[PDB]
Amino acid sequence: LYVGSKTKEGVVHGVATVAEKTKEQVTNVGAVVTGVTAVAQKTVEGAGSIAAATGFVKK
Amino acid sequence: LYVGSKTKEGVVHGVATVAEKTKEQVTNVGAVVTGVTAVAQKTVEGAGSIAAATGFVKK
Amino acid sequence: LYVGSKTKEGVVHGVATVAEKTKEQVTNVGAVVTGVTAVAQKTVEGAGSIAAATGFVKK
Amino acid sequence: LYVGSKTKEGVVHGVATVAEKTKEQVTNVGAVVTGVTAVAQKTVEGAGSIAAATGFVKK
Amino acid sequence: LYVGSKTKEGVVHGVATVAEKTKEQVTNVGAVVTGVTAVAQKTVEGAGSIAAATGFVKK
């Protein structure tokens, strides 16, 4: 049993990003996720998330 | 049992980022996630998250 | 049982970042996460998070 | 049982960062996380976090 | 049972950082974390955190 000589899993490569000008405003009362950039994940025998917003959980 | 000579898992490579000018404002009353950049994760036999916002949990 | 000669897991490589000017403001009453940059994690037999905001937990 | 000749886990490499000018303001009443940069973690048989904000816990 | 000739776990390498000018202000009434830079952690059979803010815990 073998796995590949060059194996790439959950990978980000070679990202550029420019904001030559920007305005951003957020208002929140009682979830916000913003700007999440160049992100890499691997999960094994368990769940994964990368930008998760839940406003509220009630039980 | 073998795993690959060059194996890459949950990897970020070669990121550039410029803000030549920026304004950002946040207001929050009672979750905000912002600017999360160039992030790498691996998890094994357990869950993962990278930008998680929950406004509130109530039980 | 063998694991790869060059094995990379949960890795950040080669990040550049410039703010040639910036303004940032935050106001919070009763969670905020900002600017999280160039971050690497591995977890084994246990959970992971990297930018987690919970406004409040109540029980 | 063997693990790789060059094995890298939870690693940050080669980060540059410039603020040629910046203003930042924070106001908080009753959690804020900011500027978290170039961070590396590994955890084994136990959980991990890197930028975690909880506004309050009540029980 | 063997572990790799060059093994790197929870490592930061080769960080540069400049603030050619900066202003920062914080106001807090009743948690703030800022500027956390170039940080490396490993934990075994126990939990880990690197920038953790809890506004208050009440029981």
Side-chain angles (χ1 to χ4, degrees):
Chain A
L1 169 61
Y2 173 102
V3 180
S5 186
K6 301 185 64 171
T7 294
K8 293 166 65 166
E9 303 188 31
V11 177
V12 173
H13 190 292
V15 180
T17 288
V18 183
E20 301 196 356
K21 186 149 61 181
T22 278
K23 302 191 183 186
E24 176 171 352
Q25 301 193 10
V26 173
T27 294
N28 178 11
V29 182
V32 177
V33 179
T34 176
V36 183
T37 296
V39 181
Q41 179 177 83
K42 179 173 172 182
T43 76
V44 181
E45 298 187 48
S49 68
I50 296 179
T54 303
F56 60 84
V57 180
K58 187 178 297 190
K59 302 190 184 183
Chain B
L1 169 61
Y2 173 103
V3 180
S5 186
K6 301 185 64 171
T7 294
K8 293 166 65 166
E9 303 188 31
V11 177
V12 172
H13 190 292
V15 180
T17 289
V18 183
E20 301 196 356
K21 186 149 61 181
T22 278
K23 302 191 183 186
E24 176 171 352
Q25 301 193 10
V26 173
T27 294
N28 178 11
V29 182
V32 177
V33 179
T34 176
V36 183
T37 296
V39 181
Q41 179 177 83
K42 179 173 172 182
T43 76
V44 181
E45 298 187 48
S49 68
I50 296 179
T54 303
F56 60 84
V57 180
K58 187 178 297 190
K59 302 190 184 183
Chain C
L1 169 61
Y2 173 103
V3 180
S5 186
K6 301 185 64 171
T7 294
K8 293 166 65 166
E9 303 188 31
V11 177
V12 173
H13 190 292
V15 180
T17 288
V18 183
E20 301 196 356
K21 186 149 61 181
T22 278
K23 302 191 183 186
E24 176 171 352
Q25 301 193 10
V26 173
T27 294
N28 178 11
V29 182
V32 177
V33 179
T34 176
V36 183
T37 296
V39 181
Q41 179 177 83
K42 179 173 172 182
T43 76
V44 181
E45 298 187 48
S49 68
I50 296 180
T54 303
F56 60 84
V57 180
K58 187 178 297 190
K59 302 190 184 183
Chain D
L1 169 61
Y2 173 103
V3 180
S5 186
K6 301 185 64 171
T7 294
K8 293 166 65 166
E9 303 188 31
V11 177
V12 173
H13 190 292
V15 180
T17 288
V18 183
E20 301 196 356
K21 186 149 61 181
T22 278
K23 302 191 183 186
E24 176 171 352
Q25 301 193 10
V26 173
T27 294
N28 178 11
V29 182
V32 177
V33 179
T34 176
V36 183
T37 296
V39 181
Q41 179 177 83
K42 179 173 172 182
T43 76
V44 181
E45 298 187 48
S49 68
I50 296 180
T54 303
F56 60 84
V57 180
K58 187 178 297 190
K59 302 190 184 183
Chain E
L1 169 61
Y2 173 103
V3 180
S5 186
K6 301 185 64 171
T7 294
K8 293 166 65 166
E9 303 188 31
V11 177
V12 173
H13 190 292
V15 180
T17 288
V18 183
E20 301 196 356
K21 186 149 61 181
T22 278
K23 302 191 183 186
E24 176 171 352
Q25 301 193 10
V26 173
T27 294
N28 178 11
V29 182
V32 177
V33 179
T34 176
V36 183
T37 296
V39 181
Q41 179 177 83
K42 179 173 172 182
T43 76
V44 181
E45 298 187 48
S49 68
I50 296 179
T54 303
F56 60 84
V57 180
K58 187 178 297 190
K59 302 190 184 183

Short mmCIF file of all heavy atoms in Angstrom, two decimals, chain E:
data_model
loop_
_atom_site.label_atom_id
_atom_site.label_comp_id
_atom_site.label_asym_id
_atom_site.label_seq_id
_atom_site.Cartn_x
_atom_site.Cartn_y
_atom_site.Cartn_z
N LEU E 1 10.53 1.31 16.39
CA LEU E 1 9.77 2.59 16.32
C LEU E 1 10.72 3.79 16.26
O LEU E 1 11.47 4.03 17.21
CB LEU E 1 8.73 2.68 17.46
CG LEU E 1 8.05 4.06 17.66
CD1 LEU E 1 7.24 4.52 16.45
CD2 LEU E 1 7.09 4.01 18.85
N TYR E 2 10.68 4.57 15.19
CA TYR E 2 11.58 5.70 14.93
C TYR E 2 10.81 6.95 14.50
O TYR E 2 9.81 6.84 13.79
CB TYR E 2 12.59 5.27 13.86
CG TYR E 2 13.50 6.36 13.33
CD1 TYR E 2 14.83 6.45 13.77
CD2 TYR E 2 13.04 7.24 12.34
CE1 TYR E 2 15.69 7.42 13.23
CE2 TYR E 2 13.89 8.22 11.80
CZ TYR E 2 15.22 8.31 12.25
OH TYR E 2 16.06 9.21 11.68
N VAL E 3 11.30 8.14 14.84
CA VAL E 3 10.74 9.43 14.38
C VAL E 3 11.78 10.27 13.64
O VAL E 3 12.96 10.25 13.97
CB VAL E 3 10.05 10.18 15.54
CG1 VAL E 3 9.45 11.52 15.09
CG2 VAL E 3 8.90 9.35 16.12
N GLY E 4 11.34 10.98 12.60
CA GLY E 4 12.14 11.48 11.48
C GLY E 4 13.41 12.26 11.82
O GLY E 4 13.36 13.20 12.61
N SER E 5 14.51 11.92 11.13
CA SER E 5 15.84 12.52 11.27
C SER E 5 15.83 14.04 11.46
O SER E 5 16.47 14.53 12.39
CB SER E 5 16.69 12.16 10.04
OG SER E 5 18.01 12.61 10.22
N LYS E 6 15.07 14.77 10.64
CA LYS E 6 14.78 16.19 10.84
C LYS E 6 13.27 16.37 10.98
O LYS E 6 12.55 16.52 10.00
CB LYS E 6 15.37 17.03 9.69
CG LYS E 6 16.89 16.88 9.57
CD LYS E 6 17.53 17.80 8.51
CE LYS E 6 17.37 19.29 8.85
NZ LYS E 6 18.18 20.15 7.95
N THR E 7 12.76 16.39 12.20
CA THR E 7 11.31 16.52 12.45
C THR E 7 11.01 17.87 13.10
O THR E 7 11.62 18.20 14.11
CB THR E 7 10.78 15.36 13.30
OG1 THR E 7 10.88 14.18 12.55
CG2 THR E 7 9.31 15.51 13.67
N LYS E 8 10.09 18.65 12.53
CA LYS E 8 9.74 20.00 12.98
C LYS E 8 8.26 20.02 13.35
O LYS E 8 7.43 19.73 12.50
CB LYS E 8 10.09 21.00 11.87
CG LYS E 8 11.62 21.09 11.68
CD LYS E 8 12.08 21.79 10.40
CE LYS E 8 11.70 23.27 10.34
NZ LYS E 8 12.45 23.98 9.26
N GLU E 9 7.91 20.36 14.58
CA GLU E 9 6.53 20.37 15.05
C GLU E 9 6.21 21.63 15.83
O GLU E 9 6.90 21.94 16.79
CB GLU E 9 6.25 19.14 15.91
CG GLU E 9 6.54 17.83 15.18
CD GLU E 9 6.09 16.59 15.98
OE1 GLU E 9 5.10 16.68 16.73
OE2 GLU E 9 6.72 15.52 15.84
N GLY E 10 5.16 22.36 15.48
CA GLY E 10 4.85 23.62 16.16
C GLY E 10 6.02 24.59 16.05
O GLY E 10 6.64 24.90 17.06
N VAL E 11 6.37 25.03 14.85
CA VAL E 11 7.59 25.83 14.62
C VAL E 11 7.28 27.11 13.87
O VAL E 11 6.57 27.08 12.88
CB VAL E 11 8.65 25.02 13.86
CG1 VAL E 11 9.90 25.84 13.55
CG2 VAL E 11 9.08 23.79 14.66
N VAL E 12 7.87 28.23 14.26
CA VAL E 12 7.91 29.47 13.48
C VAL E 12 9.33 29.70 13.00
O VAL E 12 10.26 29.62 13.79
CB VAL E 12 7.41 30.65 14.30
CG1 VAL E 12 7.60 31.99 13.59
CG2 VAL E 12 5.93 30.51 14.61
N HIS E 13 9.52 30.03 11.73
CA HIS E 13 10.83 30.30 11.14
C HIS E 13 10.83 31.57 10.29
O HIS E 13 9.96 31.76 9.46
CB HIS E 13 11.24 29.07 10.34
CG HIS E 13 12.67 29.13 9.87
ND1 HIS E 13 13.18 30.01 8.93
CD2 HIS E 13 13.69 28.36 10.36
CE1 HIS E 13 14.50 29.77 8.87
NE2 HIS E 13 14.83 28.78 9.71
N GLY E 14 11.84 32.42 10.46
CA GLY E 14 12.16 33.47 9.50
C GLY E 14 11.07 34.53 9.38
O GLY E 14 10.53 34.72 8.29
N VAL E 15 10.74 35.21 10.46
CA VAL E 15 9.73 36.29 10.46
C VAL E 15 10.40 37.66 10.44
O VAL E 15 11.27 37.93 11.26
CB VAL E 15 8.80 36.17 11.68
CG1 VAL E 15 7.75 37.28 11.69
CG2 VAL E 15 8.09 34.82 11.70
N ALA E 16 9.97 38.56 9.58
CA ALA E 16 10.30 39.98 9.63
C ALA E 16 9.05 40.80 9.91
O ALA E 16 7.94 40.35 9.64
CB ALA E 16 11.00 40.38 8.33
N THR E 17 9.16 41.98 10.51
CA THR E 17 8.01 42.82 10.87
C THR E 17 8.46 44.26 11.01
O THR E 17 9.38 44.54 11.77
CB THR E 17 7.39 42.34 12.19
OG1 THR E 17 6.72 41.12 11.98
CG2 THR E 17 6.34 43.29 12.78
N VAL E 18 7.79 45.18 10.35
CA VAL E 18 8.09 46.61 10.47
C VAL E 18 6.81 47.40 10.68
O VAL E 18 5.84 47.21 9.96
CB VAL E 18 8.86 47.12 9.24
CG1 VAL E 18 9.23 48.59 9.39
CG2 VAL E 18 10.13 46.32 8.99
N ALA E 19 6.83 48.34 11.61
CA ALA E 19 5.86 49.42 11.69
C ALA E 19 6.61 50.73 11.48
O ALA E 19 7.25 51.22 12.40
CB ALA E 19 5.15 49.33 13.04
N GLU E 20 6.61 51.31 10.27
CA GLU E 20 7.39 52.53 10.02
C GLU E 20 6.80 53.75 10.75
O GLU E 20 7.52 54.67 11.10
CB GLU E 20 7.59 52.82 8.52
CG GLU E 20 8.32 51.69 7.76
CD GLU E 20 8.88 52.10 6.37
OE1 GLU E 20 8.66 53.24 5.90
OE2 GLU E 20 9.55 51.26 5.72
N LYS E 21 5.49 53.72 11.04
CA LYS E 21 4.79 54.50 12.06
C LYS E 21 3.54 53.75 12.45
O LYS E 21 3.02 52.95 11.67
CB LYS E 21 4.52 55.93 11.55
CG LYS E 21 3.93 56.84 12.65
CD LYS E 21 4.33 58.31 12.48
CE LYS E 21 3.85 58.92 11.17
NZ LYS E 21 4.28 60.34 11.04
N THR E 22 3.02 53.93 13.65
CA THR E 22 1.75 53.33 14.08
C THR E 22 1.14 54.16 15.20
O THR E 22 1.88 54.62 16.07
CB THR E 22 1.97 51.87 14.52
OG1 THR E 22 1.98 51.06 13.37
CG2 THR E 22 0.89 51.27 15.43
N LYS E 23 -0.18 54.26 15.24
CA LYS E 23 -0.94 54.57 16.45
C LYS E 23 -1.85 53.39 16.78
O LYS E 23 -2.51 52.86 15.90
CB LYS E 23 -1.76 55.86 16.28
CG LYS E 23 -0.89 57.08 15.95
CD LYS E 23 -1.71 58.37 16.07
CE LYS E 23 -0.88 59.59 15.68
NZ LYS E 23 -1.61 60.86 15.94
N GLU E 24 -1.93 53.00 18.04
CA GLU E 24 -2.91 52.02 18.51
C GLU E 24 -3.54 52.52 19.81
O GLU E 24 -2.83 52.96 20.71
CB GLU E 24 -2.27 50.65 18.67
CG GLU E 24 -3.22 49.60 19.27
CD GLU E 24 -2.66 48.17 19.23
OE1 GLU E 24 -1.60 47.92 18.61
OE2 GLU E 24 -3.29 47.26 19.82
N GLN E 25 -4.86 52.43 19.92
CA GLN E 25 -5.59 52.72 21.15
C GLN E 25 -6.48 51.55 21.53
O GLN E 25 -7.14 50.97 20.67
CB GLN E 25 -6.43 53.99 21.00
CG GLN E 25 -5.60 55.23 20.64
CD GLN E 25 -6.36 56.54 20.79
OE1 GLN E 25 -7.46 56.62 21.33
NE2 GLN E 25 -5.80 57.63 20.33
N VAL E 26 -6.55 51.25 22.81
CA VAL E 26 -7.49 50.27 23.36
C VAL E 26 -8.21 50.90 24.54
O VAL E 26 -7.58 51.47 25.42
CB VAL E 26 -6.77 48.98 23.79
CG1 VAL E 26 -7.71 48.01 24.52
CG2 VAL E 26 -6.17 48.25 22.59
N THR E 27 -9.52 50.73 24.62
CA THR E 27 -10.31 50.99 25.82
C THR E 27 -11.10 49.73 26.15
O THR E 27 -11.76 49.18 25.28
CB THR E 27 -11.22 52.20 25.62
OG1 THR E 27 -10.41 53.35 25.49
CG2 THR E 27 -12.15 52.45 26.81
N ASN E 28 -11.06 49.27 27.39
CA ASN E 28 -11.76 48.08 27.83
C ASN E 28 -12.44 48.36 29.16
O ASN E 28 -11.80 48.88 30.08
CB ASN E 28 -10.73 46.95 27.89
CG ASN E 28 -11.28 45.63 28.39
OD1 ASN E 28 -12.46 45.42 28.52
ND2 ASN E 28 -10.42 44.69 28.67
N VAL E 29 -13.71 47.98 29.30
CA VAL E 29 -14.41 47.98 30.58
C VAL E 29 -14.92 46.58 30.84
O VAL E 29 -15.75 46.07 30.10
CB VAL E 29 -15.53 49.03 30.60
CG1 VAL E 29 -16.22 49.04 31.96
CG2 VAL E 29 -14.98 50.43 30.33
N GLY E 30 -14.43 45.93 31.89
CA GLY E 30 -14.88 44.61 32.36
C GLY E 30 -14.61 43.43 31.43
O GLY E 30 -14.87 42.30 31.82
N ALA E 31 -12.17 41.48 27.91
CA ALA E 31 -10.86 40.97 27.52
C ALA E 31 -10.41 41.48 26.15
O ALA E 31 -11.18 41.47 25.20
CB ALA E 31 -10.94 39.44 27.55
N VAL E 32 -9.15 41.90 26.03
CA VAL E 32 -8.53 42.33 24.77
C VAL E 32 -7.18 41.64 24.59
O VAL E 32 -6.37 41.63 25.51
CB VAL E 32 -8.35 43.85 24.71
CG1 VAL E 32 -7.64 44.29 23.42
CG2 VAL E 32 -9.70 44.57 24.77
N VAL E 33 -6.91 41.10 23.41
CA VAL E 33 -5.62 40.52 23.03
C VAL E 33 -5.16 41.16 21.73
O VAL E 33 -5.92 41.19 20.77
CB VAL E 33 -5.75 38.99 22.91
CG1 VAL E 33 -4.43 38.36 22.49
CG2 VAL E 33 -6.16 38.35 24.24
N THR E 34 -3.94 41.68 21.66
CA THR E 34 -3.43 42.44 20.50
C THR E 34 -1.96 42.17 20.22
O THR E 34 -1.19 41.83 21.12
CB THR E 34 -3.72 43.95 20.63
OG1 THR E 34 -3.14 44.65 19.56
CG2 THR E 34 -3.18 44.60 21.89
N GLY E 35 -1.54 42.30 18.96
CA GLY E 35 -0.13 42.28 18.55
C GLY E 35 0.58 40.94 18.64
O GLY E 35 1.77 40.89 18.35
N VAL E 36 -0.09 39.85 19.03
CA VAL E 36 0.52 38.52 19.23
C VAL E 36 1.23 38.06 17.96
O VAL E 36 0.58 37.82 16.95
CB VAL E 36 -0.53 37.50 19.66
CG1 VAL E 36 0.08 36.13 19.94
CG2 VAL E 36 -1.27 37.94 20.93
N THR E 37 2.56 37.95 17.97
CA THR E 37 3.38 37.83 16.76
C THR E 37 4.42 36.73 16.89
O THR E 37 5.11 36.66 17.90
CB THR E 37 4.09 39.17 16.48
OG1 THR E 37 3.15 40.17 16.20
CG2 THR E 37 5.03 39.13 15.27
N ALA E 38 4.63 35.93 15.85
CA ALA E 38 5.71 34.95 15.76
C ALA E 38 5.69 33.96 16.94
O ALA E 38 6.60 33.94 17.76
CB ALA E 38 7.05 35.67 15.58
N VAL E 39 4.62 33.18 17.06
CA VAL E 39 4.37 32.33 18.23
C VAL E 39 4.32 30.86 17.86
O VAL E 39 3.66 30.51 16.89
CB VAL E 39 3.10 32.75 18.95
CG1 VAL E 39 2.85 31.88 20.17
CG2 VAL E 39 3.19 34.21 19.41
N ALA E 40 4.94 29.99 18.64
CA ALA E 40 5.02 28.56 18.38
C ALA E 40 4.62 27.76 19.61
O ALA E 40 5.11 28.02 20.70
CB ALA E 40 6.46 28.28 17.97
N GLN E 41 3.78 26.75 19.46
CA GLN E 41 3.32 25.93 20.57
C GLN E 41 3.27 24.45 20.20
O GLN E 41 2.82 24.10 19.11
CB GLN E 41 1.93 26.42 20.99
CG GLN E 41 1.29 25.64 22.15
CD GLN E 41 -0.05 26.26 22.52
OE1 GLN E 41 -1.07 25.98 21.92
NE2 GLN E 41 -0.11 27.14 23.48
N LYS E 42 3.62 23.56 21.12
CA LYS E 42 3.20 22.17 21.05
C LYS E 42 2.62 21.71 22.38
O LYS E 42 3.18 21.99 23.42
CB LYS E 42 4.36 21.29 20.55
CG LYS E 42 3.91 19.82 20.49
CD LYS E 42 4.94 18.89 19.85
CE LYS E 42 4.47 17.44 20.03
NZ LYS E 42 5.43 16.45 19.47
N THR E 43 1.52 20.96 22.38
CA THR E 43 0.94 20.38 23.60
C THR E 43 0.69 18.90 23.41
O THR E 43 0.34 18.46 22.31
CB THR E 43 -0.31 21.13 24.09
OG1 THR E 43 -1.43 20.81 23.31
CG2 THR E 43 -0.18 22.65 24.05
N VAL E 44 0.88 18.08 24.44
CA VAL E 44 0.73 16.62 24.35
C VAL E 44 -0.11 16.12 25.51
O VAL E 44 0.17 16.45 26.65
CB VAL E 44 2.10 15.93 24.30
CG1 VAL E 44 1.97 14.42 24.19
CG2 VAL E 44 2.92 16.44 23.11
N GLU E 45 -1.14 15.33 25.23
CA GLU E 45 -2.12 14.84 26.21
C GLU E 45 -2.78 15.96 27.05
O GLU E 45 -3.23 15.74 28.17
CB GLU E 45 -1.54 13.68 27.03
CG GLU E 45 -1.18 12.49 26.14
CD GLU E 45 -0.76 11.25 26.93
OE1 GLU E 45 -1.46 10.86 27.89
OE2 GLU E 45 0.26 10.62 26.57
N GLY E 46 -2.85 17.17 26.49
CA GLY E 46 -3.47 18.34 27.12
C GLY E 46 -3.75 19.44 26.11
O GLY E 46 -3.06 19.56 25.09
N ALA E 47 -4.78 20.25 26.37
CA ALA E 47 -5.27 21.29 25.47
C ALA E 47 -4.26 22.42 25.21
O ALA E 47 -3.30 22.58 25.95
CB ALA E 47 -6.57 21.83 26.06
N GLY E 48 -4.49 23.23 24.18
CA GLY E 48 -3.69 24.42 23.88
C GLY E 48 -4.53 25.58 23.35
O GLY E 48 -5.54 25.39 22.68
N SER E 49 -4.09 26.81 23.61
CA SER E 49 -4.62 28.05 23.05
C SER E 49 -3.50 29.05 22.82
O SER E 49 -2.43 28.88 23.41
CB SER E 49 -5.71 28.62 23.95
OG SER E 49 -5.16 29.07 25.17
N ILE E 50 -3.67 30.06 21.97
CA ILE E 50 -2.59 31.03 21.69
C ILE E 50 -3.03 32.48 21.79
O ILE E 50 -2.25 33.28 22.30
CB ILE E 50 -1.85 30.70 20.38
CG1 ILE E 50 -1.13 29.34 20.52
CG2 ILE E 50 -0.84 31.82 20.07
CD1 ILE E 50 -0.35 28.89 19.29
N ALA E 51 -4.24 32.84 21.40
CA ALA E 51 -4.80 34.15 21.68
C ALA E 51 -6.26 33.96 22.09
O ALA E 51 -7.15 33.89 21.25
CB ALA E 51 -4.60 35.03 20.45
N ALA E 52 -6.51 33.87 23.39
CA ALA E 52 -7.83 33.54 23.92
C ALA E 52 -8.36 34.72 24.74
O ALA E 52 -7.73 35.12 25.71
CB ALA E 52 -7.72 32.25 24.74
N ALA E 53 -9.51 35.27 24.36
CA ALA E 53 -10.17 36.36 25.07
C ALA E 53 -11.54 35.90 25.57
O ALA E 53 -12.40 35.55 24.77
CB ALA E 53 -10.24 37.57 24.14
N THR E 54 -11.79 35.93 26.88
CA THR E 54 -13.12 35.73 27.47
C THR E 54 -13.54 36.98 28.22
O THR E 54 -12.87 37.36 29.17
CB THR E 54 -13.15 34.50 28.38
OG1 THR E 54 -12.76 33.35 27.68
CG2 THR E 54 -14.56 34.23 28.90
N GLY E 55 -14.63 37.64 27.84
CA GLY E 55 -15.00 38.91 28.47
C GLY E 55 -15.28 38.75 29.96
O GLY E 55 -14.62 39.37 30.77
N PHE E 56 -16.15 37.81 30.35
CA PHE E 56 -16.24 37.32 31.72
C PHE E 56 -16.82 35.90 31.79
O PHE E 56 -17.56 35.49 30.90
CB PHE E 56 -17.00 38.28 32.63
CG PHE E 56 -18.43 38.58 32.25
CD1 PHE E 56 -19.47 37.71 32.63
CD2 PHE E 56 -18.73 39.75 31.53
CE1 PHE E 56 -20.79 38.00 32.27
CE2 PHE E 56 -20.05 40.04 31.17
CZ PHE E 56 -21.08 39.16 31.53
N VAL E 57 -16.48 35.14 32.82
CA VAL E 57 -17.17 33.89 33.17
C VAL E 57 -17.96 34.11 34.46
O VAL E 57 -17.39 34.60 35.43
CB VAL E 57 -16.17 32.74 33.35
CG1 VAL E 57 -16.87 31.43 33.73
CG2 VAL E 57 -15.36 32.50 32.07
N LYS E 58 -19.24 33.73 34.51
CA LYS E 58 -20.09 33.83 35.71
C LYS E 58 -20.79 32.51 36.00
O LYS E 58 -21.35 31.91 35.09
CB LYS E 58 -21.06 35.01 35.54
CG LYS E 58 -21.85 35.29 36.82
CD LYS E 58 -22.80 36.49 36.75
CE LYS E 58 -22.08 37.83 36.50
NZ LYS E 58 -23.00 38.99 36.68
N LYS E 59 -20.80 32.05 37.25
CA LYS E 59 -21.42 30.78 37.66
C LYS E 59 -22.23 30.90 38.95
O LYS E 59 -21.81 31.60 39.88
CB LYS E 59 -20.36 29.67 37.76
CG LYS E 59 -19.59 29.44 36.45
CD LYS E 59 -18.73 28.17 36.55
CE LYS E 59 -17.89 28.00 35.27
NZ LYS E 59 -17.11 26.74 35.30
#
